[PDB]
Symmetry: C3
Subunit: 356 residues, 3 copies
């Protein structure tokens, strides 16, 4: 009976699964896109507009004749936002004061505006990159991450309050038999969440000849999963009660990737299938002489990409891919913003040069 | 007796603990804040000062009348450092030569100085950010990290030479009983270091009915831990002798976070407490029929934050948080410095434009 | 016989080894050095050349008199590339059009060129840093990584098609005895690849009293490794057939470092040597009463650096060190390139200022 499923035989599998289950109902921060540079650029646009002729200001759709000019079409919303911001009480005075241009002669206003031309041209692509980053990463949010991870763990597309429910944990609820419920990657794939995987790898079936405590001796299996997982919820509660795992905060792509890699290194191939958990014979039925496992039906080395298409695996992968991008773009945005704030400071100094 | 504590029953716990114990007496490099930009900025300040009027130079506390001017108050130490540096033999000549301003006419000196105004204004916030980074990360040092990690592993706040000593490894030395010494997170928390955790999870008690080799069959337990851990040091020596772990270098936040996450995923909850190591009944006493473990008294899922307040856990967390910041700030500083060096090169070119 | 080598006794060692073996025949992307800034700089050089005098253009070795001028020596290839690019049909017209300098008066051409002086001087060190990064990281390629990792796993310095072959997996082929083949770090070091390590830790010897299934019960050992590993290949095939591991993509330094750290934390020291896999007595012979392991002969805590000199360990370390550098330099290059593109946009705006 060492070859049967005994207490602790799935203990090490359980540790990896526990780490994954701790991704449920997650409250993480995400890497911050530093968008302070956008305000700095807007401030420069407001200075430029303030220093413009009464004819140019009168303009604030581009007007007939420029409706089709590619520069006017791109700049219009930017100019419109600047004009609107400038209308606010004391805002133009403040803009001019910061620039050293309060009560400036017209000669100086014009020279100062012209001086801004290269500065604005240098800042434009920096600002446009920052605005692109912002847009590209706008779905990397704590909420979106939490929902995707709750789909992975519990099959529930919600930010919080996710709980074990077989209707969600197994795709279309539990099958007619445990053997069929504990299959994934196959034509009738059922064990499509981390929680279903835990049930398959750890449950105590009713009726005797069970593998109670396969996932650890500290589980208090107070009930059982019924026959054919009919009442898996009570048993899952007892199993998951033993899990204390917490992921690092903020959550990183690297951590998620390491967790998926850890699972992949535990799956074992036999007879044309892959298995997570102890498999002896027949199938993943919850019987001690058979197996307490997930059967990745027809999974093989050359078809391992199919593991990554299983819903929980795909959801976690999507989150990691989003975080991988956002981590880099956040670091880039720090510098873009600092540079734009520096351009704003430069624009505020040009009058000093020109007076002198 | 499979449910008793047998040889190897804590082997996998030991591997994770070994990785943590290898953080003792650590000699790591830390991410470098690239401060070369500060010198570049100083060089620009020296050029600006060199090109100033004899009246401005005569000034080198701001003088009566400017003592309260916010710009003079901020710039004074910078200007003072520039003036001091310029006094050094041949330094002003070298500054002027690099700028193409040796023997420059007064007209050109003045125009060149004015040209510097926007350049200096752009560089100022870049330099101030770099100086802020430097200050914010000045305690992320190999020494500070080593001391915090030695507190974590051995309870000894020192850079090197940390060793097992029960007076330090257990908070206030060992308790009256093993059961009480092998508790953490509770009103009389004792097992507050990684080394105490290893003792609790791995020791061979005297008097028979011990769990020798729970942490691995290659341990040569040549002695024992005494009764109630009275002579734990000799036994700890034999246990730790089997540990070969090395962390990656340079040490990273990610690695530390992964190690704490790995421990968290191993702690098992039963009867209102958490346990690391095999627990059967009664307590973590070192007796084979009872347990060889740490009891995280009253630890539960909803109170898991309390695990992170345990001294060794907090120390490692602090180190990881420091490294997480410094990794990012180091990457930012690379670009800040390159930009400041480029500004210096730009300042050295303005005379060529103005001559022509 | 719990102290003998039984089925599953090396299962956890095998999971870590499987993760390492999955580095064979790897197809990863590497962090991209963003070199778009180099083209941007070239465009600026072409604008500068276009705006130069017919005397300066006539020049396109520096000419007699400037052959030794440090500026001319550095700039010559850059200027030569610019002149060559400008000769291409319509290229000069396009350069001038982008700059607003089509049909520009000579006065404006000259003023515009002079305006470029500080811009080019600021861009020069940014471009030179980017070109340095490019050169420093030019061997961090998918091909080079794949070859080094195939040396690590299979001892075959090739990009793809690496397979088990004892002539390559063991240094100089298998030794006269398993005990001697399963040694590393010593005067006659043999087990110098991950695959040799797997053979040593997992093989089924012929002749009875073997430790079949030490690395897991799902292995179908259809044959055996012969006597003294004489036919290890067939047996290795059956063992590795059970391994499904995939590393994260793109491959990271952190992942590689974590994998080497994981192995280091598993090696156990006894009797002056280190061991990976279960060791009871005598040596790593494949006999159940002796050991199924690699013997790191004379490895000790103070000599653990010697583990990192073992060929597979060194190869993976080299890859991680290369990736660690390239990850950082890639992130730096993103900003260098954005800045150079912004300088190009600035250069294209100077005529607008000067006309006005
Ligand atoms: C900063 O404020 C400036 C105004 O003070 C903005 O300058 C305007 O910028 C656009 C380029 O996007 C130029 O558009 C060109 O216009 C000519 C035709 O110019 C004539 O008509 C306009 C409109 O009545 C008038 O403003 C001019 O003086 C001329 O009478 C076209 O042939 C080009 O294709 C292009 O459309 C404007 O000419 C220019 N105006 C002035 C007065 O400089 C500037 O864009 C602001 N900067 C930024 C970055 O937003
Ligand atoms: C580069 O070197 C310059 C000197 O060659 C520095 O310029 C000085 O910078 C401060 C701004 O921080 C200006 O302070 C203003 O001063 C006026 C009063 O100015 C009169 O008095 C000063 C002192 O006797 C004299 O230098 C001026 O010519 C005037 O006679 C105040 O009303 C302002 O609130 C502010 O305090 C200096 O005026 C300015 N001096 C000159 C000659 O330009 C410059 O700061 C250095 N750049 C950097 C970045 O450090
Ligand atoms: C942008 O294009 C410019 C040409 O339009 C390039 O300017 C040339 O740049 C080099 C600096 O690397 C200067 O070299 C100096 O030359 C003087 C001697 O100058 C006299 O002879 C040259 C050659 O016949 C002639 O071009 C000058 O007008 C003078 O008659 C030396 O004493 C210095 O040590 C140094 O060698 C050139 O003078 C300069 N030429 C002009 C016309 O400005 C410029 O380098 C290009 N920019 C970049 C970044 O590539
Ligand atoms: C588990 O239960 C099945 C179903 O009765 C039985 O066939 C096995 O022998 C038992 O271990
Ligand atoms: C460990 O030691 C205790 C104390 O004598 C005993 O109660 C247990 O039965 C033994 O295993
Ligand atoms: C493994 O094989 C060796 C060689 O015959 C023997 O000495 C051991 O007793 C056996 O377990």
């Amino acid at each position: 009976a060492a070859d049967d499923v005994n207490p602790d035989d799935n203990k090490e599998d359980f540790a990896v699964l526990c780490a994954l289950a701790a991704l449920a109902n997650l409250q993480t921060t995400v890497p911050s896109i530093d968008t302070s540079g956008l305000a700095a650029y807007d401030n420069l646009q407001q200075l430029n507009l303030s220093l413009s002729s009464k004819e140019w200001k009168s303009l604030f759709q581009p007007p007939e004749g420029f409706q089709s000019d590619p520069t006017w079409r791109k700049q219009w919303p930017i100019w419109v936002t600047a004009a609107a911001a400038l209308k606010a009480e004391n805002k133009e005075a403040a803009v001019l004061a910061r620039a050293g241009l309060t009560n400036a002669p017209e000669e100086l206003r014009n020279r100062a505006r012209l001086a801004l031309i290269p500065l604005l041209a240098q800042a434009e692509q920096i600002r446009d990159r920052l605005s692109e980053i912002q847009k590209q990463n706008e779905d990397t949010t704590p909420t979106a991450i939490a929902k995707a991870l709750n789909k992975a763990v519990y099959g529930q597309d919600k930010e919080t309050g996710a709980v074990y429910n077989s209707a969600d944990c197994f795709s279309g609820n539990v099958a007619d038999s445990t053997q069929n419920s504990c299959k994934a990657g196959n034509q009738a794939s059922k064990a499509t969440t981390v929680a279903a995987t835990i049930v398959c790898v750890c449950h105590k079936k009713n009726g005797g000849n069970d593998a109670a405590n396969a996932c650890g001796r500290l589980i208090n299996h107070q009930s059982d999963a019924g026959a054919n997982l009919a009442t898996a919820s009570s048993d899952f509660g007892d199993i998951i009660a033993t899990c204390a795992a917490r992921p690092p905060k903020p959550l990183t792509a690297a951590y998620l990737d390491s967790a998926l890699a850890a699972v992949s290194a535990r799956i074992r191939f036999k007879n044309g299938n892959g298995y997570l958990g102890k498999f002896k014979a027949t199938g993943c039925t919850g019987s001690a002489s058979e197996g307490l496992c997930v059967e990745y039906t027809a999974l093989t080395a050359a078809t391992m990409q199919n593991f990554y298409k299983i819903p929980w695996v795909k959801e976690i992968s999507n989150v990691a891919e989003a975080l991988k991008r956002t981590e880099k773009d956040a670091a880039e945005s720090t510098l873009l913003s600092t540079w734009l704030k520096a351009s704003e400071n430069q624009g505020n100094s040009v009058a000093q040069k020109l007076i002198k």
